[PDB]
């Protein structure tokens, strides 16, 4: 009865997200990302941790993908096809649609811009897509007999989802990446009061709120206007499927004032595919777009360029949107390496740039680099790291944790310095456990699963029939036919060795008085101080509370002192015991 | 009408026909002065009736009738509380 979580990727880093969860003997993989920046043998997660030189399908019964980013799904074809996992892979419909093209682009990069001795191919990418099982929003699929998973809304990118993993009473929620503040084309994350045993959250931004939405857009457009005022060019890179749409529409609306076209250097095929995917998956987008897509198509951009030409053009106000984000390789690095200038070569980073060369040094001066024939920049050259990535900040993370209300929390997809601060904040604020697992570290938690039992309707009703206003419930549990069925004693008899045991004692009364005193006066000894005893009135004269009767017979039939029958059972043993005790010698003449 | 409703409810079958007649009767309005007789008949049939749905419809109807015009329902709340206690 334990939940063992071993993040062998993105434990205290961002990238190569791949988390193993063993909850009730069901071993699930929570992501299959890849790392960016690493050259060889560390791009993909360490799958030797799962008993290499063997069949992974036996060990893992379910593989879940949060969204289509390469640090969450990049190692999927290599993993599946190469290491031989033929089991199910769960991912939302937009994730299924947009995942293979990202893999194809990175495959093109690897075979052209680098070596490809130990990489996968397009046919092997398509082979992986066969095992995929698409899961809709809030679709509680039954991957196994007892294991079931539910996809929520994450708001990071199109099709990004938080995957609950419920088996029995135990449940684990993995948010992957998410944003609690809605974008211009994506809604806010939401999850019901799941109250799971563990909640695994991203922590790439444990910083404070990033100055709302309008202020950030205003600052970004002001920087763009400042750079283009002196005729400089702008070279923002982006992955072309995440925050690219928001930046595109924002800069287009800003350009409604002056009306000069802006070049979108993500491939025209890729741009068309992005527009089509966003129009096919309108339900996954914001209510802003969900209600206004019929009136007008905001994705029909009036400004676009194909590729290499306008990049090497005259120094105008042209702002390039490079196809590969993070400045790790591709068109982004090709343009950046050939661009310099005070107003020109404005490099605005919306992403995080987790460990990739060039891009990661946003906090640095961005004028040092590490490459052959490296260049230098100037202060006016934009190296601004605008907070436009669709990631929830600290306030969003606290909001999500309070919304879900988990028993415990775990942190991944972040930096150790930020994650320790976030863990301290969570522990000090919500009084809920938090964890700090590194890559390869196993985190184990105990579980307290309740026992599923069936209680009879009659006993259940009788529970509050007398216990609505100091109460108790007594019954017998029958673990018959390998199932648990709680019933009352009568239904226990009815199930199937009967031998009733009672108390109907005749205590020789010490009180030696009249017949009236012995019979009609002794029997009124219930209401003195005793409690939790029902009251029923009868004209004849007797005390009938459950298995209690005291008016027995004549006061002295046996040739001795007065004899009276005191009767009680084990549930009402208090009354009968007290009566017998005070009748043995407690009522003298 | 009072006697017509009485005899119709008497002759109708308990589970369904009486329910249909009550459904038809609930739509048409009732004059204020005649409310007392019809609610008395409805109470009598409530006592007679054993079906739960028919008694439920009788309760709903005789609650509806209390909203009719300037009728004074202070004469029909003792029987109402009585049947509520007995229900």
């Amino acid at each position: 009865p334990e939940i063992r979580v071993t993040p062998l990727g993105a434990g205290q880093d961002v990238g190569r997200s791949c988390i193993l969860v063993s909850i009730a003997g069901k071993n699930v993989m929570l992501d299959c990302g890849m790392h960016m920046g690493f050259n060889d043998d560390r791009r993909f997660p360490d799958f030797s941790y799962i008993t290499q030189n063997g069949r992974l399908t036996d060990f893992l019964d379910c593989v879940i993908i949060s969204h289509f980013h390469l640090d969450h799904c990049g190692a999927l074809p290599y993993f599946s096809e190469m290491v031989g996992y033929d089991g199910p892979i769960y991912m939302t419909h937009p994730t299924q649609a947009i995942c293979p093209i990202l893999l194809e682009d990175y495959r093109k990069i690897a075979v052209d811009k680098k070596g490809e001795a130990n990489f996968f191919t397009s046919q092997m990418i398509k082979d992986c897509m066969k095992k995929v099982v698409a899961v809709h929003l809030h679709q509680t699929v039954q991957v196994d007999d007892e294991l079931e998973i539910k996809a929520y809304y994450a708001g990071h990118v199109l099709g990004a989802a938080m995957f609950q993993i419920k088996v029995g009473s135990e449940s684990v929620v993995y948010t992957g990446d998410y944003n609690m503040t809605p974008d211009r084309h994506l809604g806010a994350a939401w999850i019901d009061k799941c109250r799971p045993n563990l909640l695994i959250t991203q922590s790439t931004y444990a910083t404070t709120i990033r100055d709302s939405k309008r202020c950030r857009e205003r600052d970004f457009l002001k920087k763009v206007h400042e750079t283009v005022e002196r005729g400089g060019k702008v070279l923002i890179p982006v992955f072309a499927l995440g925050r690219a749409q928001e930046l595109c529409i924002l800069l287009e609306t800003f350009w409604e004032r002056m009306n000069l076209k802006v070049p979108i250097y993500f491939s025209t095929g890729l741009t068309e595919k992005a527009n089509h995917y966003y129009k096919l998956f309108i339900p996954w987008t914001n209510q802003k777009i969900r209600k206004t897509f019929v009136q007008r198509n905001m994705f029909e951009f009036k400004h676009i360029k194909a590729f290499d030409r306008a990049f090497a053009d005259n120094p105008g106000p042209m702002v390039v949107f490079a196809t590969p984000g993070m400045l790790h390789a591709g068109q982004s690095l090709q343009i950046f390496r050939k661009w310099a200038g005070n107003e020109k070569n404005m490099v605005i980073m919306p992403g995080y740039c987790v460990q990739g060369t060039v891009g990661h040094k946003i906090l640095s001066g961005q004028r040092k680099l590490e490459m052959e024939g490296r260049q230098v920049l100037e202060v006016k050259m934009q190296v601004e790291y605008m907070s436009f990535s669709a990631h929830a900040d600290a306030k969003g993370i606290m909001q999500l944790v309070g919304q879900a209300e988990p028993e415990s929390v775990l942190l991944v997809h972040g930096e150790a310095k930020k994650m320790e601060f976030l863990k301290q904040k969570i522990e000090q604020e919500l009084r809920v456990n938090c964890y700090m697992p590194a890559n390869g570290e196993t985190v184990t938690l105990p579980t307290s699963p309740s026992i599923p039992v069936g209680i009879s309707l009659g006993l259940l009703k009788r529970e509050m029939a007398q216990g609505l206003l100091p109460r108790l419930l007594h019954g017998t549990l029958i673990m018959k036919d390998s199932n648990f069925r709680l019933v009352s004693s009568e239904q226990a008899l009815k199930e199937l060795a009967e031998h009733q045991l009672r108390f109907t004692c005749r205590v020789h009364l010490h009180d030696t008085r009249k017949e009236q005193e012995t019979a009609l006066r002794v029997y009124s000894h219930l209401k003195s101080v005793l409690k939790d005893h029902c009251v029923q009135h009868l004209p004849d004269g007797s005390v009938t509370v459950e298995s209690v009767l005291l008016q027995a017979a004549a006061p002295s039939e046996d040739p001795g002192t007065k004899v009276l029958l005191v009767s009680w059972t084990y549930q009402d043993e208090e009354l009968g015991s007290f009566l017998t005790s005070l009748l043995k010698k407690g009522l003298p003449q | 009408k009072s006697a017509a409703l009485h005899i119709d409810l008497c002759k109708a079958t308990s589970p369904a026909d009486a329910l249909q007649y009550l459904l038809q009767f609930a739509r048409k309005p009732v004059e204020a002065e005649s409310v007392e007789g019809v609610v008395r008949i409805l109470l009598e049939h409530y006592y007679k009736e054993n079906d739960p749905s028919v008694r439920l419809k009788i309760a709903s109807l005789l609650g509806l009738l209390s909203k009719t015009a300037g009728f004074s329902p202070d004469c029909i709340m003792d029987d109402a509380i009585n049947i509520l206690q007995n229900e």
Partner: protein
């Protein structure tokens, strides 16, 4: 355990089940066939309908109009609501919507009846239902007509009227069309739910919509309380339709299977009727005539549009225009396009590569299909005579279909093709009977027929089946087809309008959870099987029961074992009295006594208190609580 059926219409049900602690409304439904008794609402005041002769009786005359023998009502069309006064709808906690066809009448329930509960439905159902109420309100309020007709509703007057007007039922309960404010208010009280989404209702019951395959967002519901499951099978289809097929597996292990939304005209094969419709319109168009296709803007129109796109290319009729006139035309086309993940595996595979799912986007791109919001806009400029028009309400009582029927009704060249089976095509056509227009009835109903539902029943094996009484008898038109029946091993009880069914599915053994702390103190035993005893305190929160930690006994104590085993377990000076069918044992210390009856024991104490507890405990060596 109970089921209040508020509508006698089979394909438009409204059922409320007082099951467990919640009363759940299954569908709303709006019997639109009452509109056929009224005179149609034209876009422009026609001379023919205005100058119709009033009907004569001994008494009125201006309320009723006569056209070719049939007698109609000269008033705004009215809609037969479900029975709202049978059960106080304020007590209804949840409403479950299966189809957009069953989504209508919801504004009435939500606004006028004091309903304060929740409404659960799938998003395509909500959007398409919104479009349907949009177009219905637009048609009704486009050219408003007064409601002067009230004398004919009288009980003693309706008897003498002719058959279509005499057989109308619940006429006093008919209401005019809801306003758009009510529609907007009603759709604000809705929660969107996806397929197989488990929605907990106050911790008591769990409801999931399951794909029915009949329409976009069409869903069947299963309500369960962890031991008793109730399955609601609305309109469903097992054909090759665009939505993902029926989820028949989840309907298994159902105590009660309430079954509605079965096909009308069961003898019709929908593929053959689609082919016949295409062939008929091709024949009409080839001779230079026009074609009118009364249909809903978002129902079976898409399937026949696909078949027409395939057919015209081979038929050499690409020149003729395909007009689609409705206020919600573009909205219908766009909503049909965007709901791509709500399709079957064949058509949802079109989202991987960039391509819209439905092919009528190609009809628009090649300028084959031309959708317009009305007649007065760009349609009147782009109208070409040998055309085909999909428009108006299929009831032929409002919308642009009235105008087109009045326009093309005078010529034999033009044709009107009926595809929706929910309206009697002879009765909807009644206010226009002396036309020369060629009228063709080829309804396309993809819903379950009786062979399909028989196979589904044998696959699912529900314990009890609930259906409208119309399905327990053959249809009146045939009256001799035993195959058009619901045949079940149980009698398959049925219902009529405003009938209350007491279902026999009442069961005990509600579920409860026991925490580990109390389970540690609970220890089992052995009997003849395991058994234990529990004494605890019951904690209930949100209809979920938890067992917090704070007469009968059983065993084998025959007279021989009683006398022998416990003879000298600690006391002395014990005698046995030769009593019949047992033995009486009493001690001389204070006349303490032990008596046994058949399968029973009890201990007597006489002026002694300290030894009594040990006397009881001695017998408890081999006495369980079974």
């Amino acid at each position: 355990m109970k089921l209040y059926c508020l509508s006698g219409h089979p394909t438009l049900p409204c059922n409320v089940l007082k099951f467990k602690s919640t009363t759940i409304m299954l569908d709303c439904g709006l019997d639109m066939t009452s509109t056929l008794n009224f005179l149609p609402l034209p876009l422009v005041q026609s001379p023919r309908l205005s100058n119709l002769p009033g009907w004569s009786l001994k008494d009125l005359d201006k309320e009723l109009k006569e056209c070719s023998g049939h007698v109609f009502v000269d008033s705004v069309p009215e809609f037969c609501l479900p029975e709202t006064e049978l059960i106080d709808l304020s007590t209804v906690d949840v409403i479950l919507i299966s189809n957009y066809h069953c989504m209508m009448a919801l504004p009435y329930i939500t606004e006028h009846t004091g309903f304060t509960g929740t409404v659960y439905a799938t998003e395509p159902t909500v959007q398409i239902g919104r479009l349907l109420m949009e177009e219905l309100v637009n048609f009704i309020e486009r050219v408003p007509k007064a409601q002067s007709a009230s004398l004919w509703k009288n009980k003693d007057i309706q008897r003498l009227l002719p058959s279509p007007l005499k057989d109308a039922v619940e006429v006093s309960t008919w209401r005019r069309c809801y306003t758009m404010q009510e529609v907007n208010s009603a759709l604000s009280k809705i929660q969107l739910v996806g397929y197989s989404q488990k929605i907990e209702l106050f911790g008591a019951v769990q409801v999931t919509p399951l794909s029915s395959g009949y329409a976009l967002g069409s869903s069947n519901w299963i309500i369960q309380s962890h031991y008793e499951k109730v399955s609601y099978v609305s309109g469903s289809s097992l054909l090759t339709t665009h939505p993902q097929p029926m989820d028949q597996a989840s309907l298994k292990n159902s105590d009660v299977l309430v079954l509605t939304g079965l096909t009308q005209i069961p003898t019709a094969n929908p593929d053959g009727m689609v082919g016949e419709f295409c062939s008929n319109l091709a024949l009409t168009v080839r001779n230079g005539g026009n074609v009118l296709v009364p249909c809903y803007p978002s129902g079976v129109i898409y399937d026949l549009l696909e078949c027409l796109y395939q057919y015209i290319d081979s038929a050499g009729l690409s020149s003729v225009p395909l007009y689609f006139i409705s206020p919600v035309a573009n909205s219908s086309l766009e909503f049909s396009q965007i709901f791509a993940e709500w399709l079957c595996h064949n058509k949802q595979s079109k989202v991987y590569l960039p391509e819209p799912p439905f092919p009528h986007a190609e009809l628009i791109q090649t300028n084959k299909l031309k959708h317009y919001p009305s007649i007065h806009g760009d349609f009147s400029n782009d109208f070409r005579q040998p055309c085909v028009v999909f428009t108006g309400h299929p009831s032929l009582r409002f919308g642009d279909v009235v105008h087109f029927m009045e326009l093309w009704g005078k010529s034999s060249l033009n044709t009107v093709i009926f595809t929706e089976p929910d309206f009697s095509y002879l009765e909807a056509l009644a206010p226009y009977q002396p036309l020369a227009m060629k009228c063709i009835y080829c309804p396309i109903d993809t819903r379950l027929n009786f062979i399909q539902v028989s196979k589904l029943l044998k696959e699912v094996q529900p314990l009890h089946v609930v259906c409208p009484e119309q399905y327990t008898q053959p249809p009146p038109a045939q009256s001799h087809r035993m195959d058009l029946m619901i045949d079940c091993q149980p009698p398959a009880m049925s219902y009529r309008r405003a009938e209350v069914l007491a279902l026999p599915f009442k069961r005990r053994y509600e579920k409860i959870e026991i925490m580990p702390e109390l389970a540690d103190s609970l220890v089992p035993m052995e009997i003849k099987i395991s058994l234990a005893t529990v004494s605890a305190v019951l904690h209930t929160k949100d209809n979920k029961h938890l067992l917090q930690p704070p007469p009968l006994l059983s065993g084998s104590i025959p007279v021989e074992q009683f006398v022998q085993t416990l003879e000298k377990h600690g006391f002395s000076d014990i005698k046995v009295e030769d009593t019949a069918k047992g033995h009486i044992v009493l001690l001389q210390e204070a006349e303490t006594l032990i008596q046994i009856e058949e399968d029973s024991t009890h201990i007597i104490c006489d002026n002694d208190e300290m030894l009594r507890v040990r006397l009881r405990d001695l017998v408890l060596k081999f006495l369980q609580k079974f």
